[PDB]
Design a binder for this molecule. Structure first.
Ligand code: FMN
Length: 476
């Protein structure tokens, strides 16, 4: 197969494999961090929500994505568990990608070489080699790869600290139906001395049998993929919850750090939850950064697939739209991160304005229907004329919310009850007769501001945001 078509499959599976690991990490935090902390009675219901936020919603998005990938790949969820049951030292590499990167490494291997998964994935396996390593033995391994054949040799490798150990290494290519090599299997039998005769014969049989079990486990993964863009193009516009989480990931991380330095009982309970072998000795404050890393990873992956996809290919069109949506999703995420002050205000409104009786729950710190990330514009007291009913209004870029007090200060706690249905700015006109009038098609609202300078602030901001809404809706 051509290197272009070859790199294509490597990048499509780069998307699938990394997604498996990512979704797996999301389910871990919910399993061994979220639920335990909720039932520990160490933190209040409010403090927990300030950290995880919409973590549950993040999983609901990627699961729908991952499941769709699995059906197309004809996979089951068993691959991860099936590989873990093989308690042997081995890795899997992808020759379709430059310098033959490592895409998987067993727990036994990581503990043997004292390396972590993050330090290994994406890099070539040659890091094990050192000064006392037979460079002639190494060449035999390279030739086996170039000829796409199996080989079994013995050489000296080094750990992370630099510990020497003999390596009864076995190489074996993984092939599909057409005999095309998709991956390489590398089994390592560590030892202190060079094995000969019976000692060598027994070791070879074990590492070869191990290689066969791995080939059986990764059987569904070996098969090539025809199309993948149509799936990405259908799921990416539904990655909305990321924008809220990434806008609050900074405050959520600072909450954990602050709570640790003021509560020793909390610090101990967290590290005892990081006791998990699937955590790989990695703290909770690090899993929070993963969603931000993942959304910025998509445009890099999709582009690699797109560049290795010809124009006449039926998947080329879907990858184009997928790349656009991935970048639009990434852009809106970065905007939420930058607009820090706007993020805190929307979340404050969420926890102080009781909105009930709607067809769908109202999330202020979220995405609008057409204008993207919601933005707070103006607030203040508003008196409805001919009634003089004291109401407090919140102006957003897409709608205006009228409430009733039962401002953005962290300590002061006022509770706002929802007054009427949120009036969207796509159907309202504003004119002047501190009294101002807004023109809804069905009914006419007559409100009075706190002062003259306030009315001019209301009229201008409502009008400017209304015209921005209309012209945006006229684009499509
Ligand atoms: C699946 C796989 C596993 C490998 N495992 C080892 C290993 O455990 N130790 C080692 O020295 N080389 C290992 N290699 C070989 C190196 O990755 C590399 O191909 C070899 O050292 C030749 O390096 P070179 O391209 O710079 O000549 C493995 C290769 C593959 C494909």
């Amino acid at each position: 197969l051509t290197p272009t078509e070859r790199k294509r499959q490597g990048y499509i599976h780069e998307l699938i494999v990394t997604e498996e690991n990512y979704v797996n990490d999301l389910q871990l935090v919910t399993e061994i961090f979220q639920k335990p902390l909720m039932e520990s009675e160490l933190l209040t219901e409010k403090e927990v929500a300030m950290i995880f936020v919409n973590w549950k919603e993040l999983i609901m998005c990627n699961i729908k994505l991952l499941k769709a990938l699995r059906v197309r790949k004809k996979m089951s969820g068993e691959l991860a568990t099936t590989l873990e049951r093989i308690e042997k030292n081995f890795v899997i590499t992808d020759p379709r990608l430059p310098d033959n990167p490592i895409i998987f490494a067993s727990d036994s291997f990581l503990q043997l070489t004292e390396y972590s998964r993050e330090e290994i994935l994406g890099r070539n396996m040659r890091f094990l080699q050192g000064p006392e390593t037979d460079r002639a033995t190494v060449r035999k391994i390279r030739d086996a790869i170039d000829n796409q054949t199996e080989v079994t040799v013995q050489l000296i490798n080094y750990t992370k600290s630099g510990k020497k150990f003999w390596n009864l290494f076995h190489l074996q290519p993984m092939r599909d139906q057409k005999g095309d090599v998709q991956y390489f299997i590398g089994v390592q039998l560590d030892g202190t001395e060079h094995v000969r005769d019976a000692a060598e014969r027994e070791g070879v049989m074990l590492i070869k049998k191990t290689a066969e079990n791995i080939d059986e486990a990764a059987k569904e993964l070996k098969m090539p993929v025809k199309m993948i863009g149509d799936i990405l193009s259908a799921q990416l516009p539904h990655m909305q919850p990321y924008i809220r989480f990434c806008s609050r990931q900074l405050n959520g991380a600072a909450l954990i750090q602050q709570k640790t330095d003021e509560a020793p009982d909390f610090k101990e309970f967290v590290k005892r939850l990081a006791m998990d072998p699937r955590c790989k000795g990695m703290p909770l404050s690090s899993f929070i950064l993963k969603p931000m890393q993942r959304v910025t990873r998509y445009p890099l992956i999709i582009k690699n697939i797109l560049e290795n996809t010809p124009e006449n290919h039926p998947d080329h069109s879907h990858l184009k739209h997928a790349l656009e949506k991935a970048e639009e999703l990434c852009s809106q995420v970065n905007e939420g991160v930058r607009e820090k002050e706007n993020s805190d205000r929307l979340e404050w409104i969420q926890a102080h304005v009781q909105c009930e009786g709607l067809s769908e729950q109202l999330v202020f710190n979220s995405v609008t229907n057409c204008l993207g990330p919601r933005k707070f514009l103006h607030s203040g007291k508003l008196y409805k004329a001919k009634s003089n009913k004291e109401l407090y209004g919140f102006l957003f870029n897409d709608f205006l919310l009228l409430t009733q007090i039962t401002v953005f200060s962290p300590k002061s706690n006022l509770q706002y009850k929802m007054y009427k249905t949120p009036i969207f700015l796509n159907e309202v006109l504003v004119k002047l007769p501190p009294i101002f009038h807004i023109s809804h098609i069905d009914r006419v609202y007559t409100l009075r501001a706190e002062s003259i300078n306030e009315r001019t602030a209301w009229v201008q901001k409502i009008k400017a945001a209304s015209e921005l809404y209309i012209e945006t809706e006229k684009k499509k």
